[PDB]
Ligand binder design. Structure first.
Ligand code: NAG
Ligand code: NAG
Ligand code: NAG
Ligand code: CA
Ligand code: CA
Ligand code: CA
Ligand code: CA
Ligand code: CA
Ligand code: CA
Ligand code: CA
Ligand code: CA
Ligand code: CA
Lengths: 247, 272, 272, 265, 36
């Protein structure tokens, strides 16, 4: 059997249950939100995660396949560090870290036949390989004085259950495949330099990518979806959003 | 030929085709480097030819082909003659390798190529196998389920694959027939071919120079046969080996029989 | 049953009982810890079960039983299944041990206990042997003449006795039949039993994973047989061995036959 | 001499009644008592075995035919009973806190089981007929079971969370578990200390004989709560000593071994 | 007829028309946006 098969397990007049068994190259990326409080510049408000889209185009076995991936995090732990109540001490009201109790969600979508009209899916399962996400170096640009740098943090992402999801964006809406990942804390720890904090496991939410373009992980997925028998039907993908007009 | 043959039990036994099959056939020996090393002579080939001349084989009919090692010979062997004899040194650290060599040369294989990247293959019957040749073959396999995912292995994480070979020059692999396997091979250094085992090759004759009979051609564990052209010797030198072969070459070639399938210089037919 | 059976030759060959015996029977492998180690996977049992499932053997019929050493297994082997396979490594220094193991599990024994101190025993026929099990058995025996004296030994001096075992976990002792022997055994760690060899056990199949055929089941030095449920593989890995056993399990079970005598878990019957 | 085959045997009704096999089956067979430590404790003698054998001698059982094999308690004997003799007698004390233990022991020894192995971690089992049960032995067995539905999901239990499972056994040395026939059950067992085996009950074992030394008949061998039988080799006694019990066993050993018949297997 | 029934008013090769008649307890809540 080919690595990119497509089979029919049932076919009525208009509909048909099509099986798909395909290899994929999930290239995703974190994205951090940094909100700095006012005053002098010695107090930071939040250092958190933001769901991050990343669209790429990779090469299949003699085919070019465009994709769209979206990384998110759930159940992260909220730490904080306050060394003084005065406007001249370095303080971080709330920053996020990832540990065992958290999960990493990755929605995936391609331009292939599997995701053309996918709204119904059963017999879902996947074989994913594990990777290692390492944090980078974020230099807190204080107004004057020293420059603490949050540096380090490593954590291994291991395959977990799979589900469906919907990637919403200002351009496209995608009925997508949701891969979950659990976390096992690794040896490289993250520490704020020139500060009384160090040797605490997890990943920092300031520079998770470590100056990388993405995190790559290869996988295979196998499902059975409902596709109209005629291979000409199309489900709306693009969007034109005007939500949060009150905002 | 689909047609039948007929005969009778009253007809007479013809004269000996020996002393003519010799003339109109060629003989080829496959000796290890160790032999010429222990000998330290530069005219032993002409000597053995002059000896064969008494047994009937003319001057330009015998040939000798060195092979540094069993595995270096197992790497794409090429037997292109009319009567091949192989002298094979015994070593318990090479038993399966010099049994796979036997399984390859004594038998006659019909081989198709394999594209691991684009396809996932399976063995149909108990005669289909996967034979892989090259300088260092590391073969791993993940069996698959009805929905093309892994069984005790991850279809992507090659560490979770199941290792059937570790840096081997010639591997003959049989897996559970009826399931699809995803393979990982050192394709840069080794080529793997899906080969079916046809009727045997009666042109060659293996001679285990040392230890007891261990070659199990049949991959099934029940048979463990000993064909007629799988001989054994006990040795302490090599000149005695060669003199014994020359003295009992008639029995060897009576145990061997010319081929019927086709003319081919490799150890396996190719049919794409 | 004592009655006779009758039949004919016109009656027809009934259908294959394979594909129903697989459903109504159990299969049990006995593998070495070396195999689990070389594999280094915690799902290979489920893998092999899912594989067997294609050969017809259902899920809950295949079983795997780790045995760390040939000797540790030889210490009271407990086979309780309908079809037992044993994978046995080859070691010259363990030749007689893995031969006695074969001699014990392949054949069916009827055993009475032995009270060395109170009584003195002898062997009657060429199948009445003395099998001793335990963690470290060191056995010595003194033959006795017609008038209950020693021959080359003294009834009191345990050092004059003739040693036949030296810290062996399983021993099968055959002594001269017709004379009474006084024994000395490390009874604290070992139990010895006077056993009679009955017809063979057709439920078990030994598979020598390594070297040449060495097993001499029969104690007499004239037969040197090789039965049908006694196989030989040549190996460099273990996944190939298991894939082979799976792909050729039907030949194995055709070489084996369910028992006739009774239901028993031990390798030998007890009748006091 | 055909083994493994079952053939019709014929007979008549005018043949004469052959001689007695008693007084010869004794000489060519062995007997084995299984007495508790309490009895030797009360006795406080080191020659009572020789005494009983010299007494047996008068009933025809010679010296080297009778054997005594001691056990400390009912459950310690329940752990892998090895009854390997031509005739087996088992003296058994009565205690309301052990009724099920000494019913399971009876069910196990009086009957001849065909036991296949079990691998909990991989497989999920079911009982097919009313004779298929799961017998677990060991020093401390603790068994929990979850029935499953048609689509391999739980019924009042979660396949992962072992706590949700239903406890049928709690630190028992011998358990004979019968569950509903037709539903695949997932198990959790203290496999470090206990071994569990899928056993089909065949015809009975006529080679053993249980003798309840105290209270009334309680043994519900049959799992089905309808039969509640009482076989011929399920005896009862009233006791205030143990020497009287042993003298009685001796003096009536002939009826005991007439109630016991050597095995078929 | 139950309170939480589930009926199949038709059935084709793949799809099916099902009827659902069920009781519910809508526990809802408002939320205000203040801006100063
Ligand atoms: C076969 O051998 C015999 C005996 O030497 C000889 O007479 C005969 O001529 C031979 N056949 C032919 C065709 O020469
Ligand atoms: C016996 O085998 C033949 C050939 O496969 C088949 O047609 C027939 O139905 C079988 N009968 C039984 C009773 O299995
Ligand atoms: C059977 O019993 C009768 C009466 O005691 C006796 O005469 C006869 O000899 C016995 N049979 C044999 C074979 O001894
Ligand atoms: Ca090889
Ligand atoms: Ca694996
Ligand atoms: Ca095969
Ligand atoms: Ca031994
Ligand atoms: Ca001596
Ligand atoms: Ca003997
Ligand atoms: Ca109990
Ligand atoms: Ca529960
Ligand atoms: Ca039941």
């Amino acid at each position: 059997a080919q690595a990119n098969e497509d089979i029919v397990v049932s076919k009525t007049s208009l509909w048909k249950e099509m099986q798909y068994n395909r290899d994929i190259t999930i290239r995703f990326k974190f994205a951090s939100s940094i909100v700095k409080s006012g005053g002098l510049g010695y107090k930071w408000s939040e250092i958190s995660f933001k769901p991050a889209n990343y669209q790429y185009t990779y090469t299949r076995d003699g085919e070019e396949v465009t994709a769209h991936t979206t990384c998110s995090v759930n159940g992260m732990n909220d730490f904080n560090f306050n060394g003084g109540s005065l406007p001249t001490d370095f303080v971080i009201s709330r920053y996020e870290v990832i540990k065992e109790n958290s999960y990493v969600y990755v929605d995936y979508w391609d331009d292939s036949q599997a995701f053309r009209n996918m709204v119904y899916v059963r017999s879902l399962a996947a074989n994913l390989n594990s990777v290692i996400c390492t944090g980078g170096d974020y230099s807190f640009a204080l107004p004057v004085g020293q420059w603490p740098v949050m540096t380090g943090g490593a954590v291994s992402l291991h395959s977990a259950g799979v589900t469906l999801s919907t990637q919403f964006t200002d351009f496209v809406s995608l009925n997508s495949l949701r891969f979950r990942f659990r976390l096992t804390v690794e040896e490289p720890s993250f520490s704020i330099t020139r500060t009384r904090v160090s040797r605490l496991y997890g990943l920092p939410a300031a520079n998770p990518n470590n100056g990388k373009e993405y995190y790559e992980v290869a996988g295979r997925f196998s499902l059975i979806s409902l596709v109209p028998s005629n291979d000409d039907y199309q489900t709306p993908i693009t969007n034109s959003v005007t939500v949060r007009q009150d905002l | 030929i689909n047609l039948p043959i007929t005969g009778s039990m009253d007809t007479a036994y013809a004269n000996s085709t020996q002393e003519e099959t010799f003339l109109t056939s060629t003989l080829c020996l496959y000796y290890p480097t160790e032999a010429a090393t222990e000998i330290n002579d530069n005219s032993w080939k002409d000597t053995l030819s002059q000896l064969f001349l008494t047994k009937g084989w003319p001057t330009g009919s015998v040939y000798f082909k060195e092979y540094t090692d069993i595995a270096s010979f197992s790497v794409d062997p090429q037997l292109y003659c009319d009567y091949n004899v192989v002298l094979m040194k015994y070593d318990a650290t090479l038993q399966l390798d010099m049994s796979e060599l036997a399984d390859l040369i004594l038998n006659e294989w019909l081989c198709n190529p394999m594209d691991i990247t684009l396809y996932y293959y399976q063995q149909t019957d108990e005669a289909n196998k996967w034979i892989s040749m090259g300088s260092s073959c590391t073969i791993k396999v993940c069996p698959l389920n009805t929905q093309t995912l892994g069984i005790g292995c991850l279809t992507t994480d090659t560490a979770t694959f199941e290792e059937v070979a570790t840096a081997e020059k010639l591997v003959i692999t049989d897996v559970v027939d009826g399931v699809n396997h995803k393979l990982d091979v050192t394709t840069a250094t080794c080529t793997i071919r899906n080969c079916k085992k046809l009727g045997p090759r009666e042109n060659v004759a293996v001679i285990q120079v040392g230890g007891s009979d261990v070659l199990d051609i049949t991959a099934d564990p029940t048979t463990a046969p000993q064909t007629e052209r799988m001989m054994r010797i006990n040795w302490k030198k090599w000149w005695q080996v060669f003199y014994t072969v020359v003295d009992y070459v008639n029995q060897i070639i009576q145990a061997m029989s010319k081929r019927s399938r086709s003319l081919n210089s490799a150890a396996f037919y190719y049919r794409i």
